[PDB]
């Protein structure tokens, strides 16, 4: 009773819905912003698009809602729909690639002397620079800048919790990636009067090892038929034609591979590294098989009286066997041996190279997890 109807009344009589919990132009209302992440569902590492979900915990004080006996001293804590406070119509300078879901228009926790607690989980369409640099083992970092899209920091100050909180705090276990750390730094670019956005850093690490495995098999298994086509010459010289069949076959195979590679990066591309040199490794088996094909080509051919008849017989046979013996002199196997071992150098050299680069790529550019 104690002026309850009165209080109650006066409050709703004088209280202003559309007003800011501050008095004039000054230090403003110090709103607390801090989100406990739920998990993330889709990383479009290719366009640098980020759809995650977290809690929008906001909290500041409404010294305009401090109650009295019944709602203050009666029930120190009571729930009341928002819709009555300035809400950070927050957009993300890079990210905020789309609207809020479970972000605004939801109830809030209002304390006795005016404290306000609003904890809503939400899904948000963002876009961070995971750029086409989300695959190097050295990976990269990003700028996630949150802030309102009609308000300018003049009638409120924004403030954070931790900066180490981490993003693996609610990292998706469903992620083909991994994370090292999440930096959180408060910002106010001076290119705009409006103090604004906060930059949040993603020192992301995404190592999904699954198909590069059977990709290796081609390179090496194709090599099987490759070393084979380079081995088949002094193995079965008649490989002559069958050889060409091999490369038709070998080339179509690698071209189909050419088919799956562009359409697969089509959703998760970054530096060429792997492709850069396998591209070379490609060109390598490609041309090596084709010049060996020219190795194959280079051969212009390969690619008394009684006794007289006898004598005429003696000369017939012998005469042309030298001729076909000439073909021997012409297609001997010197090259095959020499370049099948130049094949030895080439393929085992260029092989242990990307082997190496790849080797160097996973270990060397790994520690910049920062």
């Amino acid at each position: 009773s104690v002026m309850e109807d009165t209080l109650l009344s006066v409050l709703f009589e004088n209280y202003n819905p559309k007003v800011r919990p501050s008095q004039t132009v000054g230090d403003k209302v110090t709103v607390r912003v801090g989100l406990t992440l739920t998990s993330l569902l889709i990383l479009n590492e290719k366009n640098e698009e980020m759809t995650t979900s977290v809690f929008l915990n906001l909290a500041w004080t409404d010294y305009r809602l401090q109650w009295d006996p019944a709602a203050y001293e009666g029930i120190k804590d009571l729930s009341i729909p928002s819709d009555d406070v300035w809400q950070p119509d927050i957009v993300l300078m890079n990210n905020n690639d789309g609207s809020f879901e479970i972000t605004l228009h939801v109830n809030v926790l209002v304390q006795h002397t005016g404290a306000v607690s609003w904890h809503p989980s939400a899904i948000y369409r963002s876009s961070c620079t995971i750029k086409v640099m989300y695959f190097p083992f050295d990976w990269q970092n990003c700028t996630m800048v949150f802030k309102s899209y009609t308000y300018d920091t003049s009638e409120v100050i924004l403030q954070h919790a931790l900066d180490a909180m981490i993003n693996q705090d609610a990292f998706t276990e469903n992620g083909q990636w991994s994370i090292e750390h999440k930096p959180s730094r408060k910002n106010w670019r001076s290119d705009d009067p409006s103090y604004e956005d906060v930059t949040f850093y993603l020192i992301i690490q995404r190592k999904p090892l699954f198909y590069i495995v059977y990709t290796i098999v081609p390179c090496i298994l194709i090599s099987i038929l490759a070393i084979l086509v380079f081995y088949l010459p002094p193995d079965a010289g008649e490989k002559m034609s069958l050889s060409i069949s091999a490369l038709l076959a070998l080339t179509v195979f690698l071209l189909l591979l050419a088919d799956k590679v562009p359409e697969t990066s089509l959703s998760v591309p970054i530096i060429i590294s792997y492709l850069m040199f396998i591209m070379i490794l490609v060109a390598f088996s490609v041309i090596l098989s084709v010049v060996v094909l020219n190795l194959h080509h280079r051969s212009p051919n390969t690619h008394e009286a009684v006794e007289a008849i006898k004598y005429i017989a003696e000369q017939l046979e012998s005469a042309s066997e030298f001729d076909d013996l000439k073909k021997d002199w012409q297609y001997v196997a010197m090259v095959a041996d020499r370049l099948f071992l130049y094949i030895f150098i080439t393929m085992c050299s260029i092989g242990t190279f990307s082997i190496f680069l790849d080797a160097s790529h996973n270990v060397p550019p790994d520690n910049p997890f920062a």
Binding site: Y149, M240, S241, S245, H303, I309
Partner: protein, 370 residues
């Protein structure tokens, strides 16, 4: 205090939001547009659709918003939310594919005098020419008109604000590149009606396309195929033993050319390139076609290639000799003298066609690169 409540309430009462600050029958409501694309998110030259960042600077005056010491004296310039304002139905003429995004419920600023600005952070859906003339090396100028939508120059007039580039905030992630962009004003009166119609801002986007990755993959299997067909020439004249062997290649390669066709027309369908680009491939690819068919039909062009005891000896020797003849006949079929002709016949052809393909390639690259 200072007429506190009397101040605020009076203002609400006699003021109709929907009213347009019409001032006598003349100048119309003078309202100016000023678009600053902060940045672009994505574009589809094929479907000529773009999602872009726009901060619309909208200006106009409402002499009804002028004040005295009890509104301007309170705090010079202040923040009043939109609603109460008459929002020009802005519209991109041949564009407009989408609603202005974040135009709604934003705020504006009123001066001690009245002058108001409405500059809400937009990003929207666009629709501009690309025609099959945008992907050219010689580009096309995206004609984009902007201006008042349902009001005439007698009720209202949209005017421009300034010059500024489109590559000022052009997307570096675009598969295209900018030349220049200009925008000049205009008033459109129609021979239809004797009346004076709306005003408009006309954008002109002059940019040339094609990211270079494409460039390399395609022309190299061509010089690739060039060498196999090059081999298609040299293989036969230096070795007609694997004519059919090459039969294989002819199959494996035009099919390679066939499947490359699925890939690049979808590219074609993925990105609108001026068809006159297509003829490059047309004759080029098709000569691979006319040349083969002749080269290999010719490759193919050849009939079959692609005392008494003493007398016994002479009836027998005579048998060996006319078959001797016969052998020479079929060889008199596959000569190695003109396969050399076709070699230089066409290689000059290829160095002609090729250098002719390089011709227009080089030529308008003498125009584009400029």
């Amino acid at each position: 205090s200072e007429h506190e409540t009397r101040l605020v309430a009076n203002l609400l009462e006699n003021y109709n939001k929907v009213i347009r600050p019409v001032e006598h029958h003349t100048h119309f409501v003078d309202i100016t547009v000023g678009l600053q694309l902060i940045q672009l998110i994505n574009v589809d030259e094929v479907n000529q659709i773009v999602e872009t960042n726009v901060r619309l600077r909208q200006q106009w005056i409402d002499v009804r918003l002028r004040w005295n010491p009890a509104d301007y004296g309170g705090i010079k310039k202040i923040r009043l939310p939109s609603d109460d304002v008459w929002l020009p139905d802005l519209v991109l003429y041949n564009n407009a594919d989408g609603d202005f995004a974040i135009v709604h419920m934003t705020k504006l600023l009123l001066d001690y005098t009245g002058k108001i600005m409405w500059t809400p952070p937009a990003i929207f859906k666009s629709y501009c020419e690309i025609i099959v003339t945008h992907f050219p090396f010689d580009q096309q100028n995206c004609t984009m008109k902007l201006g008042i939508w349902t009001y005439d120059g007698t009720k209202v007039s949209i005017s421009p604000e300034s010059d500024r580039p489109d590559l000022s905030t052009f997307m570096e992630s675009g598969e295209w590149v900018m030349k220049d962009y200009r925008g000049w004003k205009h008033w459109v009166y129609y021979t239809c009606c004797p009346d004076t119609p709306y005003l408009d801002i006309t954008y002109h986007f002059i940019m040339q396309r094609i990211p270079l990755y494409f460039v390399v993959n395609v022309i190299i299997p061509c010089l690739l195929f060039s060498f196999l067909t090059v081999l298609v020439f040299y293989l036969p004249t230096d070795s007609g033993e694997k004519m059919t062997l090459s039969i294989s290649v002819l199959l494996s390669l035009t099919v390679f050319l066939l499947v490359i066709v699925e890939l690049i027309p979808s590219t074609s369908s993925a990105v609108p390139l001026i068809g006159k680009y297509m003829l490059f491939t047309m004759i080029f690819v098709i000569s691979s076609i006319i040349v083969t068919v002749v080269v290999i039909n010719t490759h193919h062009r050849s009939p079959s290639t692609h005392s008494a005891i003493e007398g016994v000896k002479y009836i027998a020797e005579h048998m060996k000799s006319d078959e001797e003849s016969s052998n020479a006949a079929e060889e008199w079929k596959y000569v190695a003298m003109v396969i050399d002709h076709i070699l230089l016949c066409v290689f000059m052809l290829i160095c002609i066609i090729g250098t002719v393909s390089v011709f227009a390639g080089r030529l308008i690259e003498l125009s584009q690169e400029g």
